[PDB]
Amino acid sequence: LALSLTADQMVSALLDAEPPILYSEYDPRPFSASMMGLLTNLADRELVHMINWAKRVPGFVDLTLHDQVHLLECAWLEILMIGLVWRSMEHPGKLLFAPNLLLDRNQGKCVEGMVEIFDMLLATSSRFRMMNLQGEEFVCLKSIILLNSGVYTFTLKSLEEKDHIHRVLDKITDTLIHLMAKAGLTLQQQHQRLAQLLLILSHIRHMSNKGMEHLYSMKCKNVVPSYDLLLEMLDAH
């Protein structure tokens, strides 16, 4: 039961749940149309692993299927983006979409309207580096995004669901504090770092919104995962 986990058990559950790092193809490239096709193909494959990951975040499968879908509809691009930033952290000036799709700013220019968001993503990677963000902190933040982003936009059942999400979010706060304490930070340093980490989430939200507007401007048939697509992925037998 999610609310019974110790901080150590929460960390271990989240690290265990992590999705794999996917590749692009692989063909002894480059890309004109082509770059967006590769990125779309990658994102579409990552979404499947994201659903698997979400179902392993403690407390998530306790929610109704409807609410699970809503949280993912709200969070999916933020989650792709924070994953991208983490993968890119050790690669100054580059975004590691995949190990074989490692792009710089000038390659971002090849997609109309992409550079400004590319720059925001690079700045977030820089911030992660400057904070020396740890993998255990990263998995906490990604779980927070999943549970928090859609909770403000959802009856008696809904009240029960929100209470549960808030309790699990509190457990994740406890877990972040535990990690910082185990690492030797003073109480003051712990609360300052907790705040610094959580403020990053506002920037991640900003980038997701700006990215979604950009995706929509491309006039493709499909931009967002539909309710029933998420449903089927989540609505397992």
Added chain:
Amino acid sequence: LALSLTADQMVSALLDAEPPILYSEYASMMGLLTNLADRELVHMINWAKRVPGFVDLTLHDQVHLLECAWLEILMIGLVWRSMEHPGKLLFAPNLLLDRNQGKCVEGMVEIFDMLLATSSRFRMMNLQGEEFVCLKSIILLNSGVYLEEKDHIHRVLDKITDTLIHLMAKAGLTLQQQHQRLAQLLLILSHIRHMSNKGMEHLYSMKCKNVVPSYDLLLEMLDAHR
């Protein structure tokens, strides 16, 4: 100067810096809201200049922070004055609107509902004025912060965190409760960013004369020394 303030001195400074509540002057609905927002802007700049550490930034950087934060700041203010009015948004004391009135503006109701939900969250948490004033200052300093200038902003942000924790400690919260409440408050800021992004998209969709305050307007309001 600013980084030597105690937590108590920080709180007093922020409370003292609070802008006034303006009245609406009286398609019409949006005309009224646009006029109100335009008038609130100067008062926001006056407030910003009183947030400890803000005026130590270059004017260029002060303007950038305002360009990034202005709508989030209007929104958090709206949410705060609407706390004690469940189901309604108190844009002005003479402009209290419910969601049915938000429906009269094409594309507004979705954001209206988000704002109401935020006000509802504030109510449930029993958000205090001293905490509100800290959160608003964090929006100002954090929203545009994407070397010496960034370091200064981060030191000020750390002082506001310390201040928030101090307020909680004095109120008798356990260490666990302090950390949990700090997190709860900061996560609401992600929702305020979201509402500002959606609101900006909405305002742009209206195809009015103008949406964002210009660099020159903000700089003029900041009233440079001479």
